[PDB]
Structure formats: structure tokens, C-alpha cells
Amino acid sequence: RTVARDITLLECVGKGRYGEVWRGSWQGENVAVKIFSSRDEKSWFRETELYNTVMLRHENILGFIASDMTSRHSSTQLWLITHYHEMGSLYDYLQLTTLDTVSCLRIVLSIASGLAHLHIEIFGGKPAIAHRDLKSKNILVKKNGQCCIADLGLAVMHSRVGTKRYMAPEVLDETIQVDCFDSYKRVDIWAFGLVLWEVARRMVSNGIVEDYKPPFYDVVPNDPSFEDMRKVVCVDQQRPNIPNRWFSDPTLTSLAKLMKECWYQNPSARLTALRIKKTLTKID
Ligand SMILES: COc1cc(-c2cncc(-c3ccc(C4CCN(C)CC4)cc3)c2C)cc(OC)c1OC
Ligand SMILES: COc1cc(-c2cncc(-c3ccc(C4CCN(C)CC4)cc3)c2C)cc(OC)c1OC
Numbered sequence: 313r314t315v316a317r318d319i320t321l322l323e324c325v326g327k328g329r330y331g332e333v334w335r336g337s338w339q340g341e342n343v344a345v346k347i348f349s350s351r352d353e354k355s356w357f358r359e360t361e362l363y364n365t366v367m368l369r370h371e372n373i374l375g376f377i378a379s380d381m382t383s384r385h386s387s388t389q390l391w392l393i394t395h396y397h398e399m400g401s402l403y404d405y406l407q408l409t410t411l412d413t414v415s416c417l418r419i420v421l422s423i424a425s426g427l428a429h430l431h432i433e434i435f436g437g438k439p440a441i442a443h444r445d446l447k448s449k450n451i452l453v454k455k456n457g458q459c460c461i462a463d464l465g466l467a468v469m470h471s472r473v474g475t476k477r478y479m480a481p482e483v484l485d486e487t488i489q490v491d492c493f494d495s496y497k498r499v500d501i502w503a504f505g506l507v508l509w510e511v512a513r514r515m516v517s518n519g520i521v522e523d524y525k526p527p528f529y530d531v532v533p534n535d536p537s538f539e540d541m542r543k544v545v546c547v548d549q550q551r552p553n554i555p556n557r558w559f560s561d562p563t564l565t566s567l568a569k570l571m572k573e574c575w576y577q578n579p580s581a582r583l584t585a586l587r588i589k590k591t592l593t594k595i596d
């Protein structure tokens with residue numbers, strides 16, 4: 313039989329220290345192609361090892377298609393091929409788009425659903441998985457209004473470091489219990505709470521909305537250092553601002569409470585992804 317492997321690379325949709333992401337075409341269909349830098353080869357190996365262990369399939373997880381290694385004259389070329397989401401990342405989407413109650417809840421409940429799916433061990437099934445770099449750039453928006461979680465290059469399984477702006481206090485103060493898988497779930501819940509803040513700001517109530525800002529925009533520089541983050545999060549124990557206008561809206565009042573239960577200094581006090589889902593299903 314003929315095994316069609318040609319992918320036409322059409323448009324670069326992302327370039328960074330990680331490498332590049334391209335919109336590509338296989339057999340008439342859009343795919344996304346991540347081409348890894350030499351600097352980030354271990355992220356390709358980790359995501360490939362995970363998908364060789366468990367073929368994750370969930371509506372709120374970016375859909376895997378292929379991992380390809382190709383021999384070149386003097387180098388190895390590493391590609392990850394996934395489903396393509398033309399609306400782009402949640403980070404991108406929130407820059408100009410505002411939300412209503414239904415769209416805001418649908419976004420955040422879809423993220424919580426993908427995250428609970430990663431976290432929960434299924435017997436017979438899948439190992440428990442923690443993501444370790446959850447943020448709005450690692451979430452894609454689908455045409456149906458739900459999102460999906462991307463980038464398992466730092467993921468850990470149980471049966472590069474995270475983006476510093478989103479690091480939990482125990483990562484910044486190096487107290488994290490590294491031999492305990494639950495520690496890594498609790499670092500993802502902290503980062504989830506920051507994403508929930510970023511999205512809620514863009515939900516309109518009584519004619520008011522906040523501009524898009526990243527977490528801690530008002531207290532750290534761009535590309536904040538590890539020390540900049542530690543002083544804010546660990547020493548001063550700052551948390552993102554909840555605007556007064558949220559307390560006139562029942563949805564944003566409930567979301568403020570939720571985000572505050574993702575941000576406890578004590579990791580074991582934070583809500584679980586399953587409890588976040590249940591709370592979101594009871595809002596509105
Ligand atoms: C090697 O590389 C790539 C391959 C492909 C691809 C292209 N056509 C057909 C296939 C195919 C799938 C599955 C079977 C099965 C049939 C049932 N039988 C019992 C076991 C075998 C055969 C063939 C593949 C996997 C796409 C690629 O990119 C999108 C590849 O590059 C990453
Ligand atoms: C990698 O990705 C894509 C792959 C393909 C594709 C191409 N040839 C053959 C297949 C295939 C056929 C048959 C089985 C068998 C498995 C065992 N048993 C006997 C029942 C069924 C498995 C695989 C596929 C899945 C199509 C795709 O899209 C249309 C892909 O997505 C981009």
C-alpha cells in the first residue's frame with residue numbers, strides 16, 4: 313500500500329525559543345506541525361513517550377496525529393503533528409474578543425474538563441498526568457466554543473521548567489514535595505486559577521469589561537525573573553486583583569470565589585479539578 317507522508321507547510325502561526333508551529337495540509341485536511349528547536353528536543357521526547365504509553369483521546373485535549381523523527385545530513389528534525397484549531401490560542405482570542413456569561417462558562421468548564429481528564433487515573437485506562445505548564449498560550453479555542461489543552465512536553469505520569477509568571481508559590485520557594493504526584497496536580501490548579509482570572513476579566517457585566525492583561529501584569533516586569541515572582545507570590549503573598557464590578561454579577565462573584573480556592577498558599581487546601589467542574593456546573 314501507499315503511505316502518504318507528505319505534509320505541505322502553508323503558513324507559520326507561531327515562532328519562539330521552542331521552534332515553530334505551521335498550519336499544514338495532509339490529504340486535503342489542515343494539521344498543525346510543531347517543528348522543535350535543538351534547544352527543546354526533550355519536550356518532543358517527553359510528549360512522544362507519553363503518547364506511546366497512553367493514546368489520550370478527549371475533546372478538551374489537543375488531538376494527537378503523529379510524532380516524526382527524520383534524519384538530515386548533520387541533524388535530526390523532530391515534528392509533532394496535531395489537530396489544527398484555526399481560532400488559535402485562548403491568549404490570542406482574549407486580546408480583542410469579549411465574552412458573555414454562556415461563552416465564559418463554556419470556556420472555563422471545557423478547560424477544567426480537559427484538566428480533570430489529565431489528572432484522573434483510570435484502571436483497566438490511563439495513568440494520572442500533571443501538565444506542569446498550564447497557561448492561556450497552551451489552550452486552543454475550538455469553533456464550538458470549547459477549548460483544548462496543548463503541550464505535554466513537561467507532563468509527568470503516575471500509576472525546561474514551567475513558565476515563571478504562572479509558577480505556584482511552592483515551585484518559587486522550592487518547598488514543593490517532588491516525590492509526591494499530588495504536588496504536581498496542585499501546581500496545575502494554581503495555574504488554572506490564573507487562567508480563570510484572565511478569562512473572567514473579558515466577560516462583560518453591566519456594560520463593563522476589563523482589558524486583557526496577563527496575571528501579575530501590575531507587579532512584575534515583562535519576562536519576570538524567578539526572584540521577581542518569588543517576592544510577589546511567596547514573600548508578599550500577592551494575588552490577582554478582583555475588580556469591584558464583579559460583585560454586581562452572580563457569575564463573576566462565583567468565579568472570584570473559585571479562583572481564590574485555587575490560590576491558597578497551602579497546596580493541599582486548593583480545590584481539585586473534579587471539584588472545580590462540579591462548582592462550574594452549578595453556576596447559572
Ligand atoms: C509513517 O509516517 C506516517 C504515516 C502516515 C500514514 C499514512 N497513510 C496510512 C497510514 C496507515 C495507518 C494505519 C495502517 C494500519 C492498517 C491496519 N493494519 C492492521 C495495521 C496498519 C496502515 C497505514 C499512515 C500511518 C501519515 C503520516 O503523517 C500524517 C506519517 O508521517 C508522520
Ligand atoms: C495518523 O492519522 C491518520 C491516519 C489515517 C489512516 C490512514 N490509513 C489507514 C488507517 C487505519 C485503517 C485501519 C485500522 C485498523 C486498526 C485495526 N483493525 C483492523 C480495525 C482498523 C487502523 C488505521 C488510518 C487511521 C487517516 C487519518 O485521517 C483521515 C489520519 O489523521 C490525520
Ligand SMILES: COc1cc(-c2cncc(-c3ccc(C4CCN(C)CC4)cc3)c2C)cc(OC)c1OC
Pocket residue numbers: 325326333344345346392393394395396397398399400401404449450451452462463464
Ligand atoms: C500551544 O501549542 C501548540 C499549538 C498548536 C496549534 C494548533 N492549532 C492551531 C494553532 C494556531 C493556528 C492559527 C493561529 C493564528 C493565525 C491566523 N490568525 C491571524 C490568528 C490565529 C495561531 C495558532 C496552533 C499554534 C500546535 C501545536 O503542536 C503541533 C502546539 O504545541 C503542542
